[PDB]
């Protein structure tokens, strides 16, 4: 099985065996386009070749085409694209990170805020596709005509990847829940959101399950079946065998993303997202999500902005030089705050800077920030549902200290799996099931192995003192971009 | 022979001595660092070896030194005996060790203090540090009541070792917080409150007055020590800021700003009211604001987060940008004062996005130094028109800082050719007492200006940046309290 892990920064491809060991990798980046302050765009051509060119590294290290059982696909979510019947991108993709629609959304919020959330699960925000589409049909000349004329297909990244792969125009339930046009209850596009955002039905894909045969590849390109699809963060949940209500994973990447499987129960949170975990065997599993836009990206900024480190790994030793953060906090809201704050205007703050503050306090305040952002989500989840422990993946989870401190301020176990590329695993597992490469989810769930379990060993008083300083630091990051210009 | 004035610039991190002629040209320089506390003996021979360096560099005899002028880090409290032995290290002005000892004297008495002395009570000042010495230091109070002990700031010390005299001028005395600056003698009530016996207090004279003469056994001549003021108000004097409304800012580890207010005493709730100097039997008053961390914030970009090698580097980094792009840096390392008085405030950088680089920290740090000044200059504008800024200190080398400082203040910023103005200031005071210069009018004409930075910034832009600063300062408030 071959998994396509088309991320936000870098397109992965990976190949697994029924025991879930990797037999090939292939990763390539591609430019992150910023036409204007706060705007993030991807050229779908740069994305697409980076993807296939990266399949080949995983192929060429795996040692034959039709020896491939199926293809699974997982994508950076909400990122919005458009193309023609010959498969050509009609404009750049507007990444999930892009803020160009912050205020086209804002007006619409008040009259429609609770109706958008009630149908779709989503805090309305320029994060999700619906406003991204309305821009593309309102600003790209000829697109409405061409769509009212019937020549236009929209999709999120999975839907695009599945196209050049297959010829089919599909998406799963999980990626569709992310568009803020899909009614996660009724399980179909929601007509009065198609209205509100003025989006012609002639454009939307076909929502199908997450384990399904959508179609087969072009023989040029074996005839492999494309048989699995979920949103990037959703698959991580699958890859973690989070196949039960109550189970929680937390991906640490550019940003962190924390999901509680809920399968048949749909839960509501004012400050959190209700989306779809996956559709599987005529059953739709649900989830509650907290999406934190900037975590690991702060460690990056220590490397490329002020350049006080050369490698992200330098953080652990820089940070463990101190017994505590000595009152130094780093709220790294480079682009505003994700959940639960939903402050688009908050900007990144460092606070507590005496004459003795050195690189060590920076590095520590960054890793602490990552674990603090996570606990903000989890605390908010406990206002309705019990969170026992964190299965955990992503690049930053290499950091023995981060992982440790995460568990210490959470007073819960933090459990690092033996598998790393969990997001790909899940896209494999999904593609697997539908083409009996695996019998059941219970079989899959038994090859999931716990590589290390971080035990919380921190004082309750100490834990509350540090997180009270976190909250105060956050208060001071709020609303800064409507002050400064 | 042709003669010269010797200046004694006894800093806080360095003891300099410079030799001057009628044209303020510098013929010889010696400075030697010493190692909050300072050891008298250490600072003395660090200074003393720095005299000989300066005389050697000029190729001159003790015969040519027509007068000695003394400036010094002010406030710093010292105690000695009949021949000059320190009876405990110097409690330097930076010492926050009487801090809470003044907070409980603060409510009761503070308003009565500022009325008498000009000063909002603080650790900082001289009177608390010297009661500390009668209390704590082993059985000192018992001695100082026999007449056995002399007290003074750094200036009185030097002018004891040099001279045999037990003196100080008005300006240094105005900083003791024992000197009533309206009555111009030591104030009886401030002695009572802090438990000091006058058999301890130096005699206060003008800032331009032959106090005595050096021992031949030290310098080789019996030179007169004829000028004395606190190194801040001597930069003021060295800036030829002799008329009222004249202003100088010193950009160092902190900054200091003083306005000569001459024959009238001004009051401000968030500004110190002190003495510029006595001169020709005439006391001239001044208005001072202080910032504790200005250039020390640059010191931290290199010593702390270690993102520049030499402070020099800020210029090249900051001009890469043409705005702070919303990145600000309030370096409240130890707190805020004029006009926020929040000791619990701490340093913050805000505006960080994916692309905040060293350029924005460099540009934010220079803008801060510029903004903190404006804070003090605007507090003066609540009372008196501050027309323009004469400017000295290491940071004034940063040609960017200076143009920006002018830009946000919409005022000419003036860099003088002479750069060691604290030194030059004490020499004029010495030189004048010995007809080296005739009057200040001769010095005004002699003194001259190097570069003059001109405001060229939009009234719109100038206020959008500064509102950025204030809203930034709000979010540093009260951080150590919480
Ligand atoms: N040892 C470490 N300590 C701290 N942060 C780390 C460490 N290793 C990696 N990171 C951070 O983790 C990120 C890379 O994580 P990664 O698992 O590649 O997520 P990702 O590629 O952004 N997911 P995607 O959205 O699919 O592109 C960067 O922000 C790194 O700075
Ligand atoms: N070119 C520069 N640009 C910006 N900041 C500078 C520059 N040069 C020095 N600085 C900083 O500003 C101060 C330099 O002023 P300087 O007068 O050399 O300080 P100082 O020696 O502590 N003053 P003092 O003890 O009273 O004689 C230091 O704190 C430096 O960090």
Curated annotation (Swiss-Prot), chain B:
Reaction equation(s) it catalyzes: glycerol + ATP = sn-glycerol 3-phosphate + ADP + H(+)
Broadest EC class assigned to this enzyme: transferase
Residues that hold glycerol according to the record: 74-75, 124, 231-232
Chain residues that bind sn-glycerol 3-phosphate: 12, 74-75, 124, 231
GO molecular function annotations of the record: ATP binding; glycerol kinase activity
Pathway(s) per entry: Polyol metabolism; glycerol degradation via glycerol kinase pathway; sn-glycerol 3-phosphate from glycerol: step 1/1
pH dependence of function: Optimum pH is 8.0. It is highly thermosatble.
Keywords: ATP-binding, Glycerol metabolism, Kinase, Nucleotide-binding, Transferase
UniProt binding sites for ATP: 12-14, 253, 295, 299, 394
Temperature dependence: Optimum temperature is 80 degrees Celsius.
Gene3D superfamilies, A to Z: 3.30.420.40
Binding-site residues for ADP, renumbered to this chain: 12, 16, 253, 295, 394, 398
One biological process term in Gene Ontology: glycerol catabolic process
E.C. no: 2.7.1.30
GO cellular component: a single term: cytosol
Family: Belongs to the FGGY kinase family.
Classification via PANTHER family: GLYCEROL KINASE (PTHR10196:SF69), SUGAR KINASE (PTHR10196)
Subunit structure: Homodimer.
Miscellaneous remark of the record: It is not sensitive to fructose-1,6-bisphosphate (FBP).
Function statement: Key enzyme in the regulation of glycerol uptake and metabolism. Catalyzes the phosphorylation of glycerol to yield sn-glycerol 3-phosphate. Can utilize other nucleoside triphosphates (GTP, CTP, UTP and ITP) as a phosphoryl donor.
Name of the protein described by the UniProt record: Glycerol kinase
Organism: Thermococcus kodakarensis (strain ATCC BAA-918 / JCM 12380 / KOD1) (Pyrococcus kodakaraensis (strain KOD1))
Lineage: Archaea, Methanobacteriati, Methanobacteriota, Thermococci, Thermococcales
């Amino acid at each position: 099985v071959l998994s396509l892990d088309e991320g936000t920064t870098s397109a992965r491809a990976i190949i697994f065996d029924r025991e879930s060991n990797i037999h090939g990798i292939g990763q390539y980046e591609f430019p992150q386009h910023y036409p204007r302050p706060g705007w993030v765009e991807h050229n779908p051509e740069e994305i697409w070749d980076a993807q296939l060119r990266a399949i080949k590294d995983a192929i060429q290290s795996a040692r034959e085409p039709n020896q491939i059982a199926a293809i699974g696909v997982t994508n950076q979510r909400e990122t919005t694209l458009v193309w023609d019947k010959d498969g050509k991108p009609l404009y750049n993709a507007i990444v999930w990170q892009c803020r160009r629609t912050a205020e086209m959304v804002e007006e619409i919020k008040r009259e429609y805020g609770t109706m958008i959330k009630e149908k779709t699960g989503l805090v309305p925000d320029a994060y999700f596709s619906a406003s991204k589409l309305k821009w593309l049909l309102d600003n790209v000349p000829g697109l409405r005509e061409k769509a009212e004329k019937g020549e236009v297909m929209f999709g999120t990244v999975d839907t695009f990847l599945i196209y050049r792969l297959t010829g089919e125009h599909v998406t799963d339930y999980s990626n569709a829940s992310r568009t803020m046009l899909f009614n996660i209850k009724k399980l179909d596009w929601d007509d009065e959101l198609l209205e509100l955002f003025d989006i012609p039905e002639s454009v939307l894909p076909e929502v199908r399950e997450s384990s399904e045969v959508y179609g087969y590849t072009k023989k040029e390109l074996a005839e492999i079946p494309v048989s699995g699809d979920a949103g990037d963060q959703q698959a991580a949940l699958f890859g973690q065998a989070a196949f039960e209500a109550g189970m929680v994973k937390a991906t640490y990447g550019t940003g962190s993303f924390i999901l509680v499987n809920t399968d048949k129960m749909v839960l509501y949170s004012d400050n959190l997202l209700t989306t779809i975990a996956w559709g599987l065997n005529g059953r739709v599993s649900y989830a509650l999500e907290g999406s934190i836009f900037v975590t690991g990206a702060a460690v990056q900024w220590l490397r490329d902005g002020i350049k006080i480190i050369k490698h992200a790994s330098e953080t652990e030793e820089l940070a463990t030089k101190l017994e505590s953060n000595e009152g130094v906090y780093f709220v790294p809201a480079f682009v505003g705050l994700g959940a639960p704050y939903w402050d688009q205007f908050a900007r990144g703050i460092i606070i507590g800077i005496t004459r003795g503050t050195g690189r060590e306090h920076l590095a520590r305040a960054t890793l602490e920030a990552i674990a603090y952002l996570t606990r903000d989500v989890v605390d908010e989840m406990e206002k309705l549902v019990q969170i026992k422990e964190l299965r955990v993946d992503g690049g930053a989870t290499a950091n023995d200290f981060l992982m440790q401190f995460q568990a210490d301020i959470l007073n819960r176990k933090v459990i690092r799996p033996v598998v790393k590329e969990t997001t790909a695993l899940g896209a494999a597992y999904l593609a697997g099931l539908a083409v009996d490469y695996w019998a059941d989810t219970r079989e899959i769930a038994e090859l999931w192995k716990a590589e290390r379990i971080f035990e919380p060993k921190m004082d309750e008083k100490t834990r509350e003192r540090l997180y009270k300083g976190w909250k105060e630091a956050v208060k001071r990051a709020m609303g800064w971009a409507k002050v400064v210009d």
